[PDB]
Design an enzyme around this catalytic site. Structure first.
Site, PDB file in Angstrom:
ATOM      1  N   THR B 268      15.465  -0.354  -0.676  1.00  0.00           N
ATOM      2  CA  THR B 268      14.605   0.017   0.464  1.00  0.00           C
ATOM      3  C   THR B 268      13.713  -1.152   0.930  1.00  0.00           C
ATOM      4  O   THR B 268      13.698  -1.516   2.096  1.00  0.00           O
ATOM      5  CB  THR B 268      13.817   1.318   0.189  1.00  0.00           C
ATOM      6  OG1 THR B 268      14.748   2.378  -0.110  1.00  0.00           O
ATOM      7  CG2 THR B 268      13.004   1.714   1.441  1.00  0.00           C
ATOM      8  N   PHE B 393       6.984   3.414   8.134  1.00  0.00           N
ATOM      9  CA  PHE B 393       6.375   3.861   6.885  1.00  0.00           C
ATOM     10  C   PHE B 393       5.933   5.320   6.931  1.00  0.00           C
ATOM     11  O   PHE B 393       5.108   5.738   6.141  1.00  0.00           O
ATOM     12  CB  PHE B 393       5.198   2.937   6.548  1.00  0.00           C
ATOM     13  CG  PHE B 393       5.618   1.531   6.276  1.00  0.00           C
ATOM     14  CD1 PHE B 393       6.316   1.224   5.111  1.00  0.00           C
ATOM     15  CD2 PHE B 393       5.387   0.529   7.195  1.00  0.00           C
ATOM     16  CE1 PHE B 393       6.751  -0.074   4.857  1.00  0.00           C
ATOM     17  CE2 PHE B 393       5.813  -0.768   6.949  1.00  0.00           C
ATOM     18  CZ  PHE B 393       6.468  -1.075   5.772  1.00  0.00           C
ATOM     19  N   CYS B 400       3.893   5.904   3.605  1.00  0.00           N
ATOM     20  CA  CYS B 400       4.267   5.069   2.457  1.00  0.00           C
ATOM     21  C   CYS B 400       3.043   4.490   1.775  1.00  0.00           C
ATOM     22  O   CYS B 400       2.271   3.771   2.380  1.00  0.00           O
ATOM     23  CB  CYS B 400       5.147   3.927   2.939  1.00  0.00           C
ATOM     24  SG  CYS B 400       5.767   2.884   1.606  1.00  0.00           S
TER      25      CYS B 400
HETATM   26  C1  HEM Z   1       9.975  -1.898   3.665  1.00  0.00           C
HETATM   27  C2  HEM Z   1       9.814  -1.102   2.602  1.00  0.00           C
HETATM   28  C3  HEM Z   1       9.546   0.348   2.625  1.00  0.00           C
HETATM   29  C4  HEM Z   1       9.712   1.250   3.622  1.00  0.00           C
HETATM   30  C5  HEM Z   1      10.402   1.026   4.945  1.00  0.00           C
HETATM   31  C6  HEM Z   1       9.209   2.495   3.129  1.00  0.00           C
HETATM   32  C7  HEM Z   1       9.214   3.663   3.895  1.00  0.00           C
HETATM   33  C8  HEM Z   1       8.650   4.844   3.509  1.00  0.00           C
HETATM   34  C9  HEM Z   1       8.662   6.047   4.257  1.00  0.00           C
HETATM   35  C10 HEM Z   1       9.277   6.188   5.620  1.00  0.00           C
HETATM   36  C11 HEM Z   1       7.997   7.020   3.548  1.00  0.00           C
HETATM   37  C12 HEM Z   1       7.760   8.458   3.958  1.00  0.00           C
HETATM   38  C13 HEM Z   1       8.888   9.365   3.445  1.00  0.00           C
HETATM   39  C14 HEM Z   1       8.845  10.813   3.889  1.00  0.00           C
HETATM   40  O1  HEM Z   1       8.043  11.192   4.759  1.00  0.00           O
HETATM   41  O2  HEM Z   1       9.669  11.583   3.342  1.00  0.00           O
HETATM   42  C15 HEM Z   1       7.592   6.396   2.316  1.00  0.00           C
HETATM   43  C16 HEM Z   1       6.933   7.051   1.293  1.00  0.00           C
HETATM   44  C17 HEM Z   1       6.620   6.446   0.073  1.00  0.00           C
HETATM   45  N1  HEM Z   1       6.869   5.151  -0.263  1.00  0.00           N
HETATM   46 FE1  HEM Z   1       7.734   3.771   0.809  1.00  0.00          FE
HETATM   47  N2  HEM Z   1       8.686   2.316   1.916  1.00  0.00           N
HETATM   48  C18 HEM Z   1       8.855   1.040   1.518  1.00  0.00           C
HETATM   49  C19 HEM Z   1       8.427   0.431   0.324  1.00  0.00           C
HETATM   50  C20 HEM Z   1       7.779   1.091  -0.679  1.00  0.00           C
HETATM   51  C21 HEM Z   1       7.345   0.459  -1.880  1.00  0.00           C
HETATM   52  C22 HEM Z   1       7.497  -0.992  -2.236  1.00  0.00           C
HETATM   53  C23 HEM Z   1       6.740   1.445  -2.623  1.00  0.00           C
HETATM   54  C24 HEM Z   1       6.143   1.352  -3.973  1.00  0.00           C
HETATM   55  C25 HEM Z   1       6.168   0.353  -4.813  1.00  0.00           C
HETATM   56  C26 HEM Z   1       6.836   2.678  -1.903  1.00  0.00           C
HETATM   57  C27 HEM Z   1       6.403   3.915  -2.317  1.00  0.00           C
HETATM   58  C28 HEM Z   1       6.409   5.043  -1.541  1.00  0.00           C
HETATM   59  C29 HEM Z   1       5.843   6.296  -2.054  1.00  0.00           C
HETATM   60  C30 HEM Z   1       5.231   6.592  -3.416  1.00  0.00           C
HETATM   61  C31 HEM Z   1       5.965   7.180  -1.032  1.00  0.00           C
HETATM   62  C32 HEM Z   1       5.476   8.611  -1.075  1.00  0.00           C
HETATM   63  C33 HEM Z   1       4.046   8.646  -0.506  1.00  0.00           C
HETATM   64  C34 HEM Z   1       3.439  10.022  -0.493  1.00  0.00           C
HETATM   65  O3  HEM Z   1       4.040  10.971   0.091  1.00  0.00           O
HETATM   66  O4  HEM Z   1       2.322  10.221  -1.062  1.00  0.00           O
HETATM   67  N3  HEM Z   1       7.475   2.416  -0.739  1.00  0.00           N
HETATM   68  N4  HEM Z   1       8.029   5.064   2.313  1.00  0.00           N
END
Ligand code: HEM
Ligand code: HEM
Lengths: 458, 458
Positions: B268, B393, B400
């Site tokens: 991702t 994000f 995110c």
């Molecule tokens: C370019 C890189 C990334 C993109 C495009 C991305 C994108 C996203 C998106 C779109 C969501 C929302 C998902 C939903 O609504 O179902 C999300 C949630 C999340 N992402 Fe990422 N992410 C990235 C990198 C990361 C990294 C590096 C981490 C942790 C080390 C991370 C941890 C999380 C977590 C824990 C959530 C859940 C947040 C919550 O609902 O409390 N992500 N991400």
């Protein structure tokens, strides 16, 4: 390890006191904090206080086991007319906890549902004023915001109409309140308080206290005499019993509470709205986002309570205005016992601290390097903000009892403004912050072009 | 006024389900959106969702008073190994709010100062690998970006070295993670999953879950025993208390958070870097501008935190890659109450929506006609973009948590790549986007010619 704190420039036997001989003392203290850092000593003949600007130290200051609210010299002077009302009482005075317990349910988020209709009454008056301006005219922003916030607390609180939208010159009660506040703040900077020159100020001060007491005592007496169950703050004060002592407030304390609420509603929420609009016109992409939200959410002729709770972005705007220019910008604390602040600064029992909220809110270690920029997005995911980093409403059990009232009112009004008008910074206004009890953008003017959207009845 | 929404081609009683029986389902759904417009109904036996592609409708879907995060079927299957970690929990689960409150301050822009050195450790490993290639060799871009991103989240997050630059084949944990995710995604097509044909799939899945749990539980157990403080995400999770409940996370939940971070920090996040480098090699004038910035800013042997924050154009390039190929391209929502979408589409409580982010990002009413062009200058001032128009994000309190981490890592690494090498698209690579949980430019290869600029120690 133990450190000697910095101290700004001195004036011989007057120490630092002449640094406050300015119409902009908080702004002067902010510049001192920028030069000296997270803590400095400030000495006057007979008194010392320590000014705190970092989240690191302020988080400790906010530990209620170690520190309690202090009345600064300013609050001591305000106490000559606000008495032992909630704002100018010590925590250990019986009337503090009594009034707190009695009034807290009347200021809750749940309570806002009951105030909403009267808030809408005054907001409609504001919107109608602006709809009725001619093409070549402009708006005097802090003036109209003050008309709105004063009238709202008068109506919602005591069912009293100040009718500020029907006036150029303020209601006589307000003339006396404002002049009383001015005298209280002017006394802070006098090196020789007993000088014969100040005789006339003292006579005017006693006359203004009498105007305030007479109107408010009459409001109370009239309500007692009518029997009316208006269901407002005054009714709650007249009928309420403190669950802890079982005692009601007496009529003299009720008067002090009413004075206190009118001070608050004149001084603070109006500044918040004024600064918010200032930032919006200076940041048109932010204004677009807030206006788009208002249009999308406020779908009915007048806003409902539920609709105001839907205005997230407007809330973010208001918080970001509170970050940059918290309108009650300083609060004071005393050490309950000997203690060491931040591992480095020993304090004795009784030592005073001043929290400089605008500086706290510019702590780069918390907010990043871009602390002067207006970015509501800082508040998009609220849990990201560290504990004790954002304190525009003070701290703990001595935090602002009006916080939910102020936020609801300001959100409602700013939502309606943004729904009904486009705004123009037609003078390219240069921010000039006047200091009274609070901060406001003096001379801030705009033009508002109606979007010609009908407004519902009250 | 109330409209019937379009629907793509159906397959009798299988409805639309066979449309996702394809290698590239997100890309299929994008093509459907091009054909059908801003909204379409997608039915499968027993279920319905509505795919949204316009900012006009998505801005409503992003209203948290009206819609909350839904777990799609895919996330329900991922939850078999990611548990009630942040990504696969419902907002109303106690463990969501606790972890959110505990972890958010540790993922702030400011927290990145503390991770920066560890990020540099892995970035130096990447740069050294490429400096050590012989003249006749090339780079397998997504493969090396994944080595970088996985190792960075392992080290920053729990002081664990996957040592991916010492291996051809994945670390055993990663073999199991990828095969668990594959199984989760394959389960989307299976008509009768209790069919004995899938017994081996179920056995393999349990084995892969055991591999992931054993390593992560051991990591956690080893750290608690030692009392070692590393300031890493594991330290924060072991000591941190939720301000709201006053409770810490339990060890099971910490494990789920670590698994979740490892999933995120794998393809991702490496997809962002891979797509960015793809677009740079295909747009040499953009590459030159970014390289010029890197050379001007990155004046020391290794980058500082502050220097990374000066790489504005590199950040613009990353945003523009996220615009075209957001690597977590869809998220799911449910209606909290009955409501009407866009004045036209009535929804009942519980009804599901899917936000198709790549299509949102191609809305010509927001971005102009040239939406397929790679133009980082769209992001000169990100405040110019309307709310809910650029959402790589996600949204609101369910956005995110890793956004600042991913962006800082990607900016650092891309800046160092641009400082240290010239790049050649030696095969004239044809974009081929592989879909798993995420999107990747499969088979993307380049040659990197060293500028022969010395690199500092870690
Ligand atoms: C370019 C890189 C990334 C993109 C495009 C991305 C994108 C996203 C998106 C779109 C969501 C929302 C998902 C939903 O609504 O179902 C999300 C949630 C999340 N992402 Fe990422 N992410 C990235 C990198 C990361 C990294 C590096 C981490 C942790 C080390 C991370 C941890 C999380 C977590 C824990 C959530 C859940 C947040 C919550 O609902 O409390 N992500 N991400
Ligand atoms: C944006 C608007 C407002 C701001 C920024 C604000 C700020 C504050 C702050 C910082 C304090 C703590 C003072 C200290 O520690 O010495 C406070 C206390 C207080 N505020 Fe406000 N205030 C606002 C509006 C209101 C309103 C609308 C009311 C009443 C209608 C109100 C009533 C009070 C009272 C009674 C206290 C004393 C509470 C106690 O100690 O028990 N305020 N306010």
């Amino acid at each position: 390890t133990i450190k000697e704190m910095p101290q700004p420039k001195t004036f011989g036997e007057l120490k630092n006191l002449p640094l406050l001989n300015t119409d902009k003392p908080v702004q002067a203290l902010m510049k001192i904090a920028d030069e000296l850092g997270e803590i400095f000593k400030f000495e006057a003949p007979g008194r010392v206080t320590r000014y705190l600007s970092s989240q690191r130290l302020i988080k400790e200051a906010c530990d209620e086991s170690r520190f309690d609210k202090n009345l600064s010299q300013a609050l001591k002077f305000v106490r000559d007319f606000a008495g032992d009302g909630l704002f100018t009482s010590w925590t250990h005075e019986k009337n503090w906890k009594k009034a707190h317990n009695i009034l807290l349910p009347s200021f809750s988020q749940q309570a806002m549902k009951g105030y909403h209709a009267m808030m809408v009454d005054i907001a409609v008056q504001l919107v109608q004023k602006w709809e009725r301006l001619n093409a070549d005219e402009h708006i005097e922003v802090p003036e109209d915001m003050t008309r709105l916030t004063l009238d709202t607390i008068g109506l919602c609180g005591f069912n009293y109409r100040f009718n500020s939208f029907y006036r150029d010159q303020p209601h006589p009660f307000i003339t006396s309140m404002v002049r009383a506040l001015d005298e209280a703040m002017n006394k802070l900077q006098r090196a020789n308080p007993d000088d014969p020159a100040y005789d006339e100020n003292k006579r005017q001060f006693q006359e203004d206290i009498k105007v305030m007491n007479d109107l408010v005592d009459k409001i109370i007496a009239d309500r007692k005499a009518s029997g009316e169950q208006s269901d407002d703050l005054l009714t709650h004060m007249l009928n309420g019993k403190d669950p802890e002592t079982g005692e009601p407030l007496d009529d003299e304390n009720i008067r002090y509470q009413i004075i206190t609420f009118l001070i608050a509603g004149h001084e603070t929420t109006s500044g918040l709205l004024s600064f918010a609009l200032y930032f919006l016109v200076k940041n048109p992409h932010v204004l677009q986002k807030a206006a788009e939200e208002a249009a999308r959410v406020l779908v009915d002729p007048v806003p409902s309570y539920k609709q105001v709770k839907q205005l997230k972005y407007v809330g973010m705007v208001l918080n970001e205005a509170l970050r940059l220019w918290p309108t009650a910008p300083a609060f004071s604390l005393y050490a309950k016992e000997d203690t060491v602040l931040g591992g480095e600064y020993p304090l004795e029992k009784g030592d005073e601290l001043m929290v400089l909220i605008p500086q706290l809110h510019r702590d780069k270690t918390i907010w990043g390097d871009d602390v002067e920029e207006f970015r509501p997005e800082r508040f998009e995911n609220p849990s990201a903000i560290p504990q004790h980093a954002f304190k525009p409403f003070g701290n703990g059990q001595r935090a602002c009892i009006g916080q939910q009232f102020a936020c609801h009112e300001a959100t409602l009004v700013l939502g309606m403004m943004l729904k009904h008008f486009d705004f123009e910074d037609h003078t390219n206004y240069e921010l000039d912050i006047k200091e009274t009890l609070t901060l406001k953008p003096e001379g801030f003017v705009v033009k508002a072009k109606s979007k010609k959207i009908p407004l519902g009845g009250i």
